[PDB]
Design a binder for this molecule. Structure first.
Ligand SMILES: [Zn+2]
Lengths: 32, 577, 233
């Protein structure tokens, strides 16, 4: 994140691992 | 009769297409070269005529179908296809309306601007000739040709990408005589190929900024999975050079997934984790790669692979064989200090190379990389860092067993600069010896150090009066590599003189080594330790002022690792006293 | 050769690597070497040749080079030359092998392939150092090398038992030019307390038209006149 379509797929990968809907992870990571 | 010639052209195109789609490795190329002979014979039959206008678009269809099937099988263009283009172009000129292809094209495109309905075949011809110029690295005049095709008022557009995009195919290729490939299909190939080539050049030349543009363009459109792979790898390289590691890793993962041949990526992974210093991961990736390179189709069509250059050493797509790498693992394992691991790895290198009469040729490390005997030396310097010294002597026995003949018979020894001794023989005694110090036997050590110092000094390695064979360019002729073998041998021997308690002899060899190589500093440390024992004050200070007056180029590996090995930790500590 | 009028046409069944522009080719143990025509650069290619009794296949091309110094009636020529210990070819003795090819070929006990070309350049390539790939393109400058320039074309390379006092540990190397600058080589180990190469360009007759080698240093050759001989013993 600190470095587009790639980054969306990366959040999809994290979401598929953790079993969280991608929006929450995206928001949390963006806010941090 | 054009009915019958077109029946033949159509027939042989269907035969070539049958061959591309179906078949096995021989029957494919058998039918393909049968079709090539057919298109050759038909071309000669049509060139026998004083061309008609209605015979012209069949002849050019046959010329295009001949050059396609020629370059797809040769897997490479040449100048006979350029002469064939010249023949077809001069044949277009002598029907209605000479010098060379560029001005011939200029005049032919003016003749096509008279609108004879064969522009479908002219644009296809431009595609093939452009492919010839692209594979031949003829990028200046290509811009001029396509510039003449489109508006000449687009003259300032030197960049081929935009120019190739504007270059339109003229038709959807209406019911004319059959072709193997259409001009738009060749346009897609042109774009990705040229984009790729420009990107690679921009990468190597240190604009991995401008690279990304061309390379993303290479991805978007026709990009076969095999190119997709290598592009992404390029992207890994670029981001890695910029500083941005995680984007690089992204592309590399994609490279892995998409690829059936993921040697090139992990080398990039190695260089990445090496740039950061993640040594563990570096070695782990390389470890995988080597097992990777353990593991291992041609269309009658112009594919992109054709037009790409087989890569250079500067490229991030240069990926050696198992052997060339496993050497990398061992080198990289040795410069960290995992001597144990290193040992094993070097042994595995050496097992491959030498046992190999029966299998596939696994090869030596390549000659911008190190000579076959510098590599038995790196094997032994690992086997010393390990403390496997009775292995480090089966090494130095193995070597000089094979290479008896090559050695000097050393009768200058009796007859007491001129006779010739290649560094690696003078080394081989230097590490044959260190083996005996680890087995603890002063005599036969001071033997081998003294015999190493005789084959440095009553012989010269720089005797290329006769380039007599294949020979060590780089590693084994550097004056730096010679003065750094000498200092070392005198150190290795001067410390045996301290161990037998003859510290005058020791002093003399240490004093000699500072005279030999004043930029090693290990020499000055050993000399100053001897002087600080016995007679410090004036002598020691005289060398202090010299060190402060004083204040790596290309020494080979086995030797730097040996120097690194003996050098003491407590060295600068001593030099600030 | 078993192969179940006494004329037999070949079937294209039997064709392998219809490379088609390949002129010349040798054989070592279960390796196959070709030397193939192109534009200005001719190239050495080098294939696997399957050791098991199978469908007689090429396999994958290991290696390619381009004989960069060569820029073209007369073929060129290829010789198989093994070092001692390790075959339709010529085993040299260690002295020599070490002298001509270097420590690489020595150590690896690598068999070596000697190309005589129409220019009369006379080149050898080490087979161990000839494995390449599409990532890994064989650099000719460094990989292939150039012994001795007969100024005329080459006809016949060989190797002889001088001093005989089937696997002969041969001692000598023989070239032939077309017009007959014959070129033979041996080890001296003389006069610098060093191994040095022994070079002779003789000038036989004539046009030399072909040449074999027999028991004990005797080179059975031809001129258009007659079938003549040289002894180097
Ligand atoms: Zn070397």
């Amino acid at each position: 994140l600190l470095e587009s379509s790639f980054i969306g797929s990366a959040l999809q990968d994290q979401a598929s691992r953790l079993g969280v809907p991608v929006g929450i992870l995206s928001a949390g990571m963006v806010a941090s | 009769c054009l009915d019958l010639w077109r029946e033949k052209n159509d027939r042989l195109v269907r035969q070539a297409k049958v061959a591309q789609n179906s078949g096995l490795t021989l029957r494919r190329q058998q039918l393909a070269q049968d079709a090539l002979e057919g298109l050759r014979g038909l071309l000669h039959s049509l060139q026998g005529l004083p061309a008609a206008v209605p015979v012209l678009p069949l002849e050019l269809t046959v010329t295009c179908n001949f050059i396609i099937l020629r370059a797809s099988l040769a897997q490479g263009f040449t100048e006979d296809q350029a002469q064939d283009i010249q023949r077809s172009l001069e044949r277009v000129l002598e029907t209605q309306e000479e010098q060379g292809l560029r001005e011939l094209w200029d005049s032919v495109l003016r003749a096509s601007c008279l609108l004879p309905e064969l522009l479908s075949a002219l644009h296809r011809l431009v595609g093939l000739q452009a492919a010839l110029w692209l594979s031949a690295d003829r990028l200046g005049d290509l811009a001029l040709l396509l510039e003449t095709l489109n508006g000449s008022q687009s003259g300032a557009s030197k960049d081929l990408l935009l120019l190739l995009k504007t270059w339109s195919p003229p038709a959807e290729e209406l019911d004319a005589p059959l072709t193997l490939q259409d001009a738009q299909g060749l346009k897609d190939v042109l774009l990705t190929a040229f984009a790729y080539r420009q990107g690679l050049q921009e990468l190597i030349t240190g604009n991995p900024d401008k690279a990304l543009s061309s390379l993303h363009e290479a991805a978007s459109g026709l990009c076969p999975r095999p190119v997709l792979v290598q592009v992404y790898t390029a992207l890994g390289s670029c981001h890695r050079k910029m500083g941005n590691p995680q984007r690089a890793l992204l592309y590399l993962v994609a490279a892995l997934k998409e690829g059936s041949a993921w040697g090139p990526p992990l080398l990039e992974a190695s260089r990445l984790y090496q740039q950061l210093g993640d040594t563990t991961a570096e070695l782990e990736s390389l470890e995988l790669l080597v097992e990777a390179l353990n593991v291992p189709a041609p269309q009658f069509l112009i594919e992109v692979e054709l037009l790409l250059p087989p890569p250079d050493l500067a490229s991030p797509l240069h990926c050696g064989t198992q052997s060339q790498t496993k050497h990398i693992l061992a080198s990289r394992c040795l410069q960290t200090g995992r001597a144990g691991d290193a040992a094993e790895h070097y042994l595995d290198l050496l097992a491959l190379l030498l046992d190999s009469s029966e299998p596939r040729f696994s090869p030596p490390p390549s000659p911008p990389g190190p000579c076959m005997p510098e590599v038995f030396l790196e094997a032994a310097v690992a086997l010393i860092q390990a403390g496997r010294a009775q292995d480090a002597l089966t090494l130095c026995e193995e070597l000089l067993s094979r290479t008896s003949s090559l050695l000097p018979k050393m009768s200058r020894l009796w007859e007491d600069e001129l006779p010739y001794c290649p560094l690696w023989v003078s080394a081989t005694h230097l590490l044959q010896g260190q083996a005996w110090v680890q087995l603890g036997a002063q005599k036969v050590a001071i033997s081998e150090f003294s015999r190493c110092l005789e084959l440095l000094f009553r012989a010269t390695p720089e005797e290329k009066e006769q380039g007599a064979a294949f020979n060590c360019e780089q590693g084994c002729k550097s004056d730096a590599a010679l003065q750094q073998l000498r200092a070392a041998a005198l150190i290795s021997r001067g410390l045996e003189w301290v161990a037998s308690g003859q510290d005058t002899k020791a002093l003399q060899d240490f004093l000699l080594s500072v005279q030999m190589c004043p930029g090693n500093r290990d020499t000055y440390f050993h000399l100053l330790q001897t002087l600080k024992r016995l007679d410090r004050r004036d002598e020691a200070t005289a060398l202090w002022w010299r060190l402060e007056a004083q204040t790596l180029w290309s020494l080979p590996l086995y030797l730097e690792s040996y120097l690194s090995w003996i050098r003491p930790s407590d060295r600068d500590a001593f030099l600030e006293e | 050769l078993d192969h179940p009028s006494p004329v037999i046409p070949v079937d294209p069944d039997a064709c392998i690597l219809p490379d088609a522009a390949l002129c010349a080719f040798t054989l070592l143990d279960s390796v196959l070497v070709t030397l193939v025509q192109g534009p200005a650069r001719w190239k050495m290619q080098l294939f696997e040749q399957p050791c098991p009794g199978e469908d007689p296949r090429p396999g994958g091309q290991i290696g390619e080079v381009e004989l960069s110094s060569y820029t073209p009636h007369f073929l060129p020529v290829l010789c198989s030359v093994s070092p001692s210990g390790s075959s339709g070819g010529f085993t040299l003795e260690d002295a020599l092998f070490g002298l001509l090819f270097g420590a690489d070929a020595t150590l690896l006990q690598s068999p070596v392939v000697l190309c005589g070309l129409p220019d009369g350049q006379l080149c050898c390539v080490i087979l161990k150092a000839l494995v390449t790939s599409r990532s890994a393109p064989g650099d000719p400058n460094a990989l292939v090398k150039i012994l001795h320039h007969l100024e005329e074309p080459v006809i016949f390379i060989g190797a002889l038992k001088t001093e005989p006092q089937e696997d002969v540990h041969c001692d000598c190397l023989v070239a032939f030019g077309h017009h007959g600058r014959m070129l033979a080589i041996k080890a001296s180990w003389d006069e610098s307390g060093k191994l040095v190469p022994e070079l002779r360009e003789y000038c036989l007759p004539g046009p030399v038209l072909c040449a074999a080698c027999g028991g004990g240093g005797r080179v059975y050759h031809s001129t258009p006149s007659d079938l003549c001989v040289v002894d180097l013993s």
